[PDB]
Design an enzyme around this catalytic site. Sequence first.
Site, PDB file in Angstrom:
ATOM      1  N   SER A 231     -11.763  11.278  -4.081  1.00 14.19           N
ATOM      2  CA  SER A 231     -11.177  10.855  -2.490  1.00 14.19           C
ATOM      3  C   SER A 231      -9.806  10.848  -2.333  1.00 14.19           C
ATOM      4  O   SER A 231      -9.041  11.006  -3.501  1.00 14.19           O
ATOM      5  CB  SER A 231     -11.600   9.275  -2.126  1.00 14.19           C
ATOM      6  OG  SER A 231     -11.260   8.557  -3.167  1.00 14.19           O
TER       7      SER A 231
ATOM      8  N   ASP B 219      -6.439   8.453  -0.447  1.00 19.25           N
ATOM      9  CA  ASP B 219      -5.901   7.385   0.300  1.00 19.25           C
ATOM     10  C   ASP B 219      -4.853   8.026   1.234  1.00 19.25           C
ATOM     11  O   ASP B 219      -4.066   8.528   0.680  1.00 19.25           O
ATOM     12  CB  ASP B 219      -5.333   6.245  -0.565  1.00 19.25           C
ATOM     13  CG  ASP B 219      -6.356   5.552  -1.657  1.00 19.25           C
ATOM     14  OD1 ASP B 219      -7.518   5.260  -1.062  1.00 19.25           O
ATOM     15  OD2 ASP B 219      -6.107   5.390  -2.640  1.00 19.25           O
TER      16      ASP B 219
ATOM     17  N   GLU C 291       0.997  -1.282  -0.105  1.00 17.65           N
ATOM     18  CA  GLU C 291       0.121   0.184  -0.061  1.00 17.65           C
ATOM     19  C   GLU C 291       0.849   1.403  -0.144  1.00 17.65           C
ATOM     20  O   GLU C 291       0.412   2.198  -0.851  1.00 17.65           O
ATOM     21  CB  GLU C 291      -1.195   0.112   1.161  1.00 17.65           C
ATOM     22  CG  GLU C 291      -2.112  -0.813   1.265  1.00 17.65           C
ATOM     23  CD  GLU C 291      -3.189  -0.568  -0.040  1.00 17.65           C
ATOM     24  OE1 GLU C 291      -3.072   0.485  -0.642  1.00 17.65           O
ATOM     25  OE2 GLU C 291      -3.990  -1.293  -0.416  1.00 17.65           O
TER      26      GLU C 291
ATOM     27  N   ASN D   2      -8.858   4.985   2.411  1.00 17.12           N
ATOM     28  CA  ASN D   2      -9.508   5.866   1.565  1.00 17.12           C
ATOM     29  C   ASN D   2     -10.853   7.027   2.482  1.00 17.12           C
ATOM     30  O   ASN D   2     -11.576   6.427   3.284  1.00 17.12           O
ATOM     31  CB  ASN D   2     -10.673   5.216   0.752  1.00 17.12           C
ATOM     32  CG  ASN D   2     -11.056   6.163  -0.431  1.00 17.12           C
ATOM     33  OD1 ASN D   2     -12.196   6.556  -0.256  1.00 17.12           O
ATOM     34  ND2 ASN D   2     -10.262   6.172  -1.499  1.00 17.12           N
TER      35      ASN D   2
ATOM     36  N   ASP E 213     -12.859  10.401  -8.701  1.00 16.64           N
ATOM     37  CA  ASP E 213     -13.880  10.374  -7.821  1.00 16.64           C
ATOM     38  C   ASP E 213     -13.590  11.237  -6.544  1.00 16.64           C
ATOM     39  O   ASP E 213     -14.751  11.403  -5.445  1.00 16.64           O
ATOM     40  CB  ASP E 213     -14.444   8.920  -7.311  1.00 16.64           C
ATOM     41  CG  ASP E 213     -13.257   8.136  -6.395  1.00 16.64           C
ATOM     42  OD1 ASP E 213     -12.290   8.892  -5.514  1.00 16.64           O
ATOM     43  OD2 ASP E 213     -13.206   6.898  -5.908  1.00 16.64           O
TER      44      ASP E 213
ATOM     45  N   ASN F  30      -7.353  10.413  -5.736  1.00 14.03           N
ATOM     46  CA  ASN F  30      -8.102   9.808  -6.918  1.00 14.03           C
ATOM     47  C   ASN F  30      -8.945  10.784  -7.640  1.00 14.03           C
ATOM     48  O   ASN F  30     -10.088  11.057  -7.158  1.00 14.03           O
ATOM     49  CB  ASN F  30      -8.849   8.563  -6.326  1.00 14.03           C
ATOM     50  CG  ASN F  30      -8.176   7.635  -5.603  1.00 14.03           C
ATOM     51  OD1 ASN F  30      -7.056   7.030  -5.894  1.00 14.03           O
ATOM     52  ND2 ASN F  30      -8.394   7.645  -4.092  1.00 14.03           N
TER      53      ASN F  30
END
Length: 130
Positions: free
Chosen positions: A51, A53, A35, A60, A49, A46
């Site tokens: 969002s 992380d 990750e 998220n 959308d 991102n």
Amino acid sequence: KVFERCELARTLKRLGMDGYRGISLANWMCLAKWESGYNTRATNYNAGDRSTDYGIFQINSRYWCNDGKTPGAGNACHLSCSALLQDNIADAVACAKRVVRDPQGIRAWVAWRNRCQNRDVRQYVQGCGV
């Protein structure tokens, strides 16, 4: 903070992650590895959308933490996404535990399915005294 492998393994064990909901420490290690490369300050926005992380587990903002700029966003872990960028990973670990309590468990992370699921993950904790 960019953790060294074994240092992280013990840090996670002290935090009660070893066997949490049946998930071995080696699985958590494989997850953090892919990750963020064990990097607590890691962030991935991102654009598709809106969002982001956050942290070592790349949690998220849509459902798990509040950053004030992600629509309808839940804050299931009841934390500022900022809490997931601290060198101290206690809050991030508390949130990862919250994530896995959901039906999917660790499968919530696509990278774990891609790189840890049905794999030999023993190497991640070998020699770490855990």
